[PDB]
Design a binder for this molecule. Structure first.
Ligand SMILES: *[C@@H]1O[C@H](CO)[C@@H](O[C@@H]2O[C@H](CO)[C@@H](O[C@@H]3O[C@H](CO)[C@@H](O)[C@H](O)[C@H]3NC(C)=O)[C@H](O)[C@H]2NC(C)=O)[C@H](O)[C@H]1NC(C)=O
Lengths: 263, 98, 49, 105, 53
């Protein structure tokens, strides 16, 4: 039953935000890491990418991989995920925007897949440790020893113990739109999506349109290339611009609840 | 432990967006101007100082708060108990809570 | 007090209301990029462990 | 950098034999205690964002072979400031650090 | 390393294996390095062979 959380799957999209040290420096990665939680004990961290891997765009196979390339998704295979820290981590499971992975301690957290043409990773600061529960201060879980009540995240998805708000995206920039109509700056639209448009000069002032032109201004660099494309909600990242209109619906669960496993 | 579950900030492109003190626990919110927010296409707001950014963040219980949580108490004296066994006499057994 | 034990203080788990002296202070994002500087004491539940 | 002759910084010329091999950079790996992040290459020289590490450990993949190279060097990254982090954050104040460029000019 | 973590790649799957073990590398000498250098004196360390015979 991978088909019980279309709350997120159908209705949420792979968000894209601003990774802080994205290989070189601050890029905008779809796998932009927020909410690192090295708060459990079992060598595990629950992470949120802004990317929503899991099923595809439509309906199949948790073990596929949908991030945002362009304005668009890319719902393809997960082939070469890499979470890592001081050492390479071990994936545990993904669901939605969210991945669980068994990591060692590390001053940072450093995430990344391989699309195939490019490394395309994302990295972040977060103080991580793994004390096991017990009066022994190990650095790592052993093969043996007593079992006792640790705190730890689940493998699974059939999970409702909490839910985080996930309402709409705000707009996003896309200056690939603002082409030139041989003398005027020319906006287009994805699929009839809602493009919010005007330039520093006086011309069309809202923009709720198909592909418009621009009578007044000429330069691409003085215009509103916007995409109100709220057919799919998002995670409410701090690295999201508000959808100014409203608090739309989209209350959406968390898979990886912290549970009372006996490590 | 808290979780700074940030609500996604507002970005008005040309002019101010006054914040209000929403009733969320420790609802910290502060308007900010003087931005030029690079979001996937370079910046997107065409102004350069009237670009406004309103950050808001409130505190919320972790998901671990339900399960991994300290717990205070005002503790009075109450009443003590025991599962007293008596293997009495020739009765030879009673294991009762008292 | 923030940082000290009980920076978060909820009556129970269900209780939506609480007391969060975390000294949460937002700072402006840097150099025209979308993000949210939240400057905050890690919890007095983090310490206390 | 460029090939033997004239094109595309993002190609890859090492010596195999007495001879060069000016081909694609496909699978470079600088690394240390953890895998680093490339920043840019120019000439003999590469810039890469690394964490601290007792050593430095470099290597590409020609395709038939790993063909790496490794070395000792004491590495650290103090950020400039009275905070002794281990890593740069996403936020905080800006102040005058020392750092290498992205560029070639 | 606090641990040891091993694994190949069959090709369809990562299929690794990992374990706890306290690891260190003191070189022999009154210097407490973290790693062997390129130069310096040679002196009688303990070490495993390359070979099979
Ligand atoms: C009552 O006071 C007794 C004080 O010794 C204790 O009761 C003991 O309970 C044990 C379990 O019921 C008994 O052990 C069993 O004894 C029989 C007969 O000798 C053996 O065949 C069994 O193998 C053995 N069980 C095991 C697991 O080894 C004790 O015999 C019995 N004590 C006596 C003197 O007979 C307890 O302190 C108390 N009972 C309570 C609290 O339930």
């Amino acid at each position: 039953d991978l088909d019980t959380h279309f709350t997120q799957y159908k209705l949420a999209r792979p968000y894209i935000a601003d990774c802080p040290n994205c290989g070189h420096s601050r890029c905008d990665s779809p796998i932009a890491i927020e909410e690192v939680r090295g708060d459990a004990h079992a060598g595990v961290i629950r992470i949120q990418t802004s990317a929503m891997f899991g099923l595809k765009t439509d309906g199949v196979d948790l073990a596929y991989m949908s991030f945002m390339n362009g304005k668009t998704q890319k719902s393809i295979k997960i082939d070469n995920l890499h979470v890592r820290t001081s050492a390479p981590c071990s994936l545990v499971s993904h669901h939605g925007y969210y991945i669980l992975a068994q990591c060692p301690p590390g001053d940072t957290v450093t995430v990344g897949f391989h699309d195939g043409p490019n490394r395309h990773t994302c990295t972040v600061a977060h103080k991580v440790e793994f004390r096991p529960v017990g009066r022994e201060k190990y650095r790592h879980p052993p093969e043996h020893g007593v079992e006792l009540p640790c705190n730890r995240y689940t493998h699974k998805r059939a999970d409702q113990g909490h839910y985080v708000e996930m309402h709409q995206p705000g707009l996003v920039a896309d200056h690939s739109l603002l082409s030139i109509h041989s003398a005027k700056v020319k906006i287009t639209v994805p699929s009839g999506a809602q493009v919010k448009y005007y330039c520093k000069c006086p011309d069309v002032r809202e923009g709720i349109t198909s592909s418009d032109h621009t009578t007044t201004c000429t330069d691409v660099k003085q215009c509103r290339a916007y995409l109100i494309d709220n057919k799919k909600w998002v995670y409410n990242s701090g690295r999201l611009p508000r959808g100014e209109g409203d608090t739309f619906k989209g209350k959406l669960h968390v898979p990886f609840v912290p549970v009372k496993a006996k490590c | 432990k808290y979780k700074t579950k940030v609500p996604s900030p507002v970005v008005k492109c040309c002019g101010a967006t006054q914040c209000t003190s929403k009733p969320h626990p420790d609802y910290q919110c502060q308007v900010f101007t003087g931005v030029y927010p690079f979001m996937w296409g370079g910046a997107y707001c065409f102004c350069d100082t009237e670009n406004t950014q309103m950050s808001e963040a409130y505190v919320e219980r972790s998901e671990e708060c339900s399960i991994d949580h300290a717990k205070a108490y005002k503790v009075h004296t109450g009443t003590v108990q025991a599962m007293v066994n008596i293997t009495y006499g020739s009765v030879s057994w009673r294991s009762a809570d008292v | 007090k923030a940082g000290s034990f009980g920076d978060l203080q909820s009556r129970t788990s269900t209780s939506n209301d609480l007391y969060a002296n975390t000294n949460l202070k937002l700072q402006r994002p840097q150099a025209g990029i979308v993000h949210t500087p939240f400057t905050q004491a890690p919890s007095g539940f983090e310490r206390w462990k």
